[PDB]
Design a protein around this nucleic acid. Structure first.
Ligand SMILES: [Mg+2]
Ligand SMILES: [Mg+2]
Ligand SMILES: [Mg+2]
Ligand SMILES: [Mg+2]
Ligand SMILES: [Mg+2]
Ligand SMILES: [Mg+2]
Ligand SMILES: [Mg+2]
Ligand SMILES: [Mg+2]
Ligand SMILES: [Mg+2]
Ligand SMILES: [Mg+2]
Ligand SMILES: [Mg+2]
Ligand SMILES: [Mg+2]
Ligand SMILES: [Mg+2]
Ligand SMILES: [Mg+2]
Ligand SMILES: [Mg+2]
Ligand SMILES: [Mg+2]
Ligand SMILES: [Mg+2]
Ligand SMILES: [Mg+2]
Ligand SMILES: [Mg+2]
Ligand SMILES: [Mg+2]
Ligand SMILES: [Mg+2]
Ligand SMILES: [Mg+2]
Ligand SMILES: [Mg+2]
Ligand SMILES: [Mg+2]
Ligand SMILES: [Mg+2]
Ligand SMILES: [Mg+2]
Ligand SMILES: [Mg+2]
Ligand SMILES: [Mg+2]
Ligand SMILES: [Mg+2]
Ligand SMILES: [Mg+2]
Ligand SMILES: [Mg+2]
Ligand SMILES: [Mg+2]
Ligand SMILES: [Mg+2]
Ligand SMILES: [Mg+2]
Ligand SMILES: [Mg+2]
Ligand SMILES: [Mg+2]
Ligand SMILES: [Mg+2]
Ligand SMILES: [Mg+2]
Ligand SMILES: [Mg+2]
Ligand SMILES: [Mg+2]
Ligand SMILES: [Mg+2]
Ligand SMILES: [Mg+2]
Ligand SMILES: [Mg+2]
Ligand SMILES: [Mg+2]
Ligand SMILES: [Mg+2]
Ligand SMILES: [Mg+2]
Ligand SMILES: [Mg+2]
Ligand SMILES: [Mg+2]
Ligand SMILES: [Mg+2]
Ligand SMILES: [Mg+2]
Ligand SMILES: [Mg+2]
Ligand SMILES: [Mg+2]
Ligand SMILES: [Mg+2]
Ligand SMILES: [Mg+2]
Ligand SMILES: [Mg+2]
Ligand SMILES: [Mg+2]
Ligand SMILES: [Mg+2]
Ligand SMILES: [Mg+2]
Ligand SMILES: [Mg+2]
Ligand SMILES: [Mg+2]
Ligand SMILES: [Mg+2]
Ligand SMILES: [Mg+2]
Ligand SMILES: [Mg+2]
Ligand SMILES: [Mg+2]
Ligand SMILES: [Mg+2]
Ligand SMILES: [Mg+2]
Ligand SMILES: [Mg+2]
Ligand SMILES: [Mg+2]
Ligand SMILES: [Mg+2]
Ligand SMILES: [Mg+2]
Ligand SMILES: [Mg+2]
Ligand SMILES: [Mg+2]
Ligand SMILES: [Mg+2]
Ligand SMILES: [Mg+2]
Ligand SMILES: [Mg+2]
Ligand SMILES: [Mg+2]
Ligand SMILES: [Mg+2]
Ligand SMILES: [Mg+2]
Ligand SMILES: [Mg+2]
Ligand SMILES: [Mg+2]
Ligand SMILES: [Mg+2]
Ligand SMILES: [Mg+2]
Ligand SMILES: [Zn+2]
Lengths: 204, 140, 174, 37
RNA sequence: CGAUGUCGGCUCGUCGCAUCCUGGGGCUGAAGAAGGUCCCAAGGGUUGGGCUGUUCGCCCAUUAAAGCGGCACGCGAGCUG
RNA sequence: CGCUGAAAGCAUCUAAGCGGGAAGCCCGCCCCAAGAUGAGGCCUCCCACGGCAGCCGGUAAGGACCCGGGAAGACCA
């Protein structure tokens, strides 16, 4: 179950067999493995990956001891890939070949406090015909004396986005190892500059 | 003369093998031990029963067709959140919970009753990690 | 009137060892273990196995017949063995042996490959006859059932997979 | 399969069987097949 | 009765199953294709429009289908009126 | 819907046992999640500090405050 850490760099399209194919570019490698999780030790199998070099002056002592034990340079981010155990001490975009399908996880864009129409595609109200200050309101949220309460999970206004989202089965269109670049067809969660995780897809 | 009230006593750790025993009839006895109602100085408002260790909880037994007809149930608070789990499935997934549930239902409700339940340690399989307390083996 | 009382003739050389809750039968063709009610008693005599019941209660009466028959099928299984024949009927419909496997051409867009489980052997003498053979009576019958099920006898035509000796009962079309 | 509260022999080939807690009627004539319910 | 705002729509659902569709079956006066009838099944789905305050219903064009009921004939400290 | 099969010499999917079998059930996918007080685990960092399972005090590893900001955001985080 291979995976790698990355930054979302931006979108373009390329031309492939006289087709415009939309791509998201991802700067993925290179990731040093700074800890391995084993069944005997941790109860499961995974690899802790590091990513983006950090100014040592910004790294406190407990984190520093963690890196040093790995014989590893200080890094900005630590993230695990589940059920992955690379043979090397370093994971690069080379683990992916064009044509492979990948799942991409990122932090979606934050919309802050979102209304019922933006968050849940509610229909809101009429904009004329007498409608009174409810153009974007949810309408009814319940019944009457039975049950005399509101369901857990009721769709209502509130914060929306800046949350973990995984998009599945994205086609790897190209990989450019000398630049640690991954091209994935289509759309990936979050802003340019966002941290993402790229994994081999779980769909068959 | 006032009725005797005990100063705190070193609780007694007890070990029980559940293998082949009837689920409910074993539970009633574990509850009694938990409450400490076997002790002549029993006092209802303090935790003074035994600590009960149970092993081979997975090998608990049950009569009739209960393996497939006894349903454990859980409500999540959400619409349609009623979960139905048959005995067979519970035994095949979290076996120790079968006895735990049986006993919990036989303890008083309330703060003391909840505290008593924590003094029950149920293990599937023949082993427990409590050698340190040197549990005294109990035939029941 | 009583199957359970009927003595089981044991041909030499097949051996019947009784055990708690089970009896093991060995013969020239293989061995079989028969699961047997602890309430029943299984008795080994000279060239004969017998089964006795503890009482005339309805359950014991029921287990008795069952047990003698079960043991008897085991005895027959390791000596004679068991077979079931299938007749394929219909113009395009044929079978052939592919390694150990049975390959049915019975009018689907594809052929059907049936895999022998352990203790089961397929034979295809004619293209329209299949034989399933093995020491285990219920297994032989099960697999033969499976193969027939692939394409059951039509209600309107003499077409499909038949048990040998199965009557062709048809209904009028139009 | 006929499903009804009164299941009965329809012809002299009909056999009333009890199977898994239910009364069935089985017969060589498929029409006569009954399950109580 | 020192007040429990009553039709219909909109919004938002959620539940029942005596199931409209999709999935699985038996019987058929089941050749096939298409149906009929009963059984299992509530996971999801169940269109847009003309008329009329309408609910309902009729009609137009489609559809896999254009299900029926409960929730104070669900929902006016949510809107309409 | 079957296999094997008595009671009930036949028969029976069943009484012992075994197959097959739904968009439905359990899992599998995605998201939250140890206040899971049953408060879990692993890696790393500090250290046995003064006076009087408690108190005062100065520290350590760390953290907060304050400031420049941010596709994070009502404030807060
Ligand atoms: Mg290219
Ligand atoms: Mg992220
Ligand atoms: Mg935002
Ligand atoms: Mg809104
Ligand atoms: Mg919108
Ligand atoms: Mg939205
Ligand atoms: Mg609208
Ligand atoms: Mg309007
Ligand atoms: Mg609008
Ligand atoms: Mg107005
Ligand atoms: Mg307005
Ligand atoms: Mg509203
Ligand atoms: Mg009201
Ligand atoms: Mg209520
Ligand atoms: Mg947020
Ligand atoms: Mg962006
Ligand atoms: Mg006792
Ligand atoms: Mg019982
Ligand atoms: Mg468990
Ligand atoms: Mg209780
Ligand atoms: Mg009480
Ligand atoms: Mg002999
Ligand atoms: Mg005798
Ligand atoms: Mg016709
Ligand atoms: Mg008659
Ligand atoms: Mg018959
Ligand atoms: Mg009134
Ligand atoms: Mg008043
Ligand atoms: Mg009043
Ligand atoms: Mg009033
Ligand atoms: Mg009032
Ligand atoms: Mg409704
Ligand atoms: Mg129904
Ligand atoms: Mg259907
Ligand atoms: Mg159908
Ligand atoms: Mg047809
Ligand atoms: Mg016709
Ligand atoms: Mg039909
Ligand atoms: Mg029917
Ligand atoms: Mg039926
Ligand atoms: Mg449904
Ligand atoms: Mg539902
Ligand atoms: Mg529905
Ligand atoms: Mg309409
Ligand atoms: Mg007009
Ligand atoms: Mg209209
Ligand atoms: Mg109308
Ligand atoms: Mg009009
Ligand atoms: Mg009308
Ligand atoms: Mg009219
Ligand atoms: Mg059409
Ligand atoms: Mg149709
Ligand atoms: Mg209603
Ligand atoms: Mg009414
Ligand atoms: Mg009315
Ligand atoms: Mg109303
Ligand atoms: Mg209404
Ligand atoms: Mg209303
Ligand atoms: Mg109003
Ligand atoms: Mg109204
Ligand atoms: Mg109201
Ligand atoms: Mg009100
Ligand atoms: Mg209100
Ligand atoms: Mg009100
Ligand atoms: Mg209006
Ligand atoms: Mg008016
Ligand atoms: Mg038959
Ligand atoms: Mg038979
Ligand atoms: Mg049985
Ligand atoms: Mg099966
Ligand atoms: Mg089965
Ligand atoms: Mg079958
Ligand atoms: Mg199965
Ligand atoms: Mg599907
Ligand atoms: Mg998480
Ligand atoms: Mg914690
Ligand atoms: Mg956590
Ligand atoms: Mg709890
Ligand atoms: Mg912890
Ligand atoms: Mg753990
Ligand atoms: Mg400092
Ligand atoms: Mg700010
Ligand atoms: Zn009949």
């Amino acid at each position: 179950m291979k995976g790698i850490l990355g930054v979302k760099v931006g979108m373009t399209r390329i031309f492939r067999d006289d087709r415009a194919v939309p791509v998201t570019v991802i700067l993925a490698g290179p990731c040093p493995v700074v800890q391995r999780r084993t069944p005997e030790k941790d109860g499961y199998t995974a690899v802790q990956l590091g990513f983006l070099p950090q100014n040592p002056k910004r790294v406190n002592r407990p984190l520093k001891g963690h890196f040093a034990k790995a014989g590893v340079e200080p890094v900005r981010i630590l993230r695990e890939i589940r059920d992955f155990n690379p043979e090397g001490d370093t994971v690069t975009v080379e683990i992916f070949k064009p044509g492979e399908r990948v799942d991409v996880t990122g932090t979606s864009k934050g919309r802050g406090f979102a209304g019922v129409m933006k968050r849940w595609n509610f229909a809101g109200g009429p904009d004329s015909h007498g409608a009174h200050k409810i153009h974007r309101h949810p309408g009814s949220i319940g019944n009457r004396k039975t049950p005399g309460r509101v369901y857990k999970g009721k769709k209502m206004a509130g914060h929306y986005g800046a949350e973990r989202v995984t998009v599945m089965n994205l086609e790897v269109v190209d990989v450019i190892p000398e630049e640690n670049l991954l091209l994935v067809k289509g759309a990936v969660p979050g802003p340019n500059g966002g941290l993402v995780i790229v994994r081999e897809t779980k769909k068959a | 003369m006032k009725t005797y009230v005990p100063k705190q006593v070193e609780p007694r750790w007890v070990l029980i093998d559940a293998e082949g025993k009837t689920l409910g009839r074993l539970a009633t006895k574990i509850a009694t031990l938990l409450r400490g109602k076997h002790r002549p100085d029993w006092t209802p408002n303090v935790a003074m029963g035994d600590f009960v260790v149970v092993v081979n909880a997975d090998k608990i037994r049950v009569t009739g067709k209960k393996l497939e007809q006894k349903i454990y149930t859980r409500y999540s608070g959400y619409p349609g959140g009623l979960k139905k789990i048959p005995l067979e499935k519970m035994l095949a997934t979290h076996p120790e919970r079968v006895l735990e549930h049986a006993v919990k239902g036989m303890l008083p409700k309330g703060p003391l009753g909840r505290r008593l339940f924590k003094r029950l340690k149920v293990y599937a399989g023949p082993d427990h990690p409590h050698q340190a307390q040197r549990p005294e083996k109990l035939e029941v | 009137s009583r199957i359970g009382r009927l003595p089981i003739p044991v041909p030499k050389g097949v051996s019947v060892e009784v055990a708690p809750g089970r009896v093991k039968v060995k013969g020239p063709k293989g061995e079989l273990e028969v699961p047997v009610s602890p309430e029943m008693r299984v008795v080994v005599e000279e060239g004969v196995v017998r089964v006795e019941r503890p009482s005339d209660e309805r359950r014991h009466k029921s287990l008795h017949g069952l047990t003698r028959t079960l043991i008897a099928n085991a005895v027959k299984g390791v000596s004679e063995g068991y077979s079931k024949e299938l007749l394929i009927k219909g113009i395009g419909y044929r079978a052939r042996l592919v390694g150990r496997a049975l390959e049915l051409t019975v009018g689907f867009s594809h052929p059907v490959v049936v895999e022998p489980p352990e203790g089961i052997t397929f034979e295809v003498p004619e293209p329209t006859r299949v034989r399933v053979s093995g020491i285990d009576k219920q297994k032989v019958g099960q697999v033969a059932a499976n193969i027939r099920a692939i394409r059951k006898p039509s209600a309107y035509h003499e077409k499909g997979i038949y048990y040998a000796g199965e009557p062709v009962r048809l209904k009028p079309g139009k | 399969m006929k499903v009804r509260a009164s299941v009965k022999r329809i012809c002299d080939k009909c056999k009333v069987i009890r199977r898994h807690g239910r009364v069935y009627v089985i017969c060589e004539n498929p029409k006569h097949k009954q399950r109580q319910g």
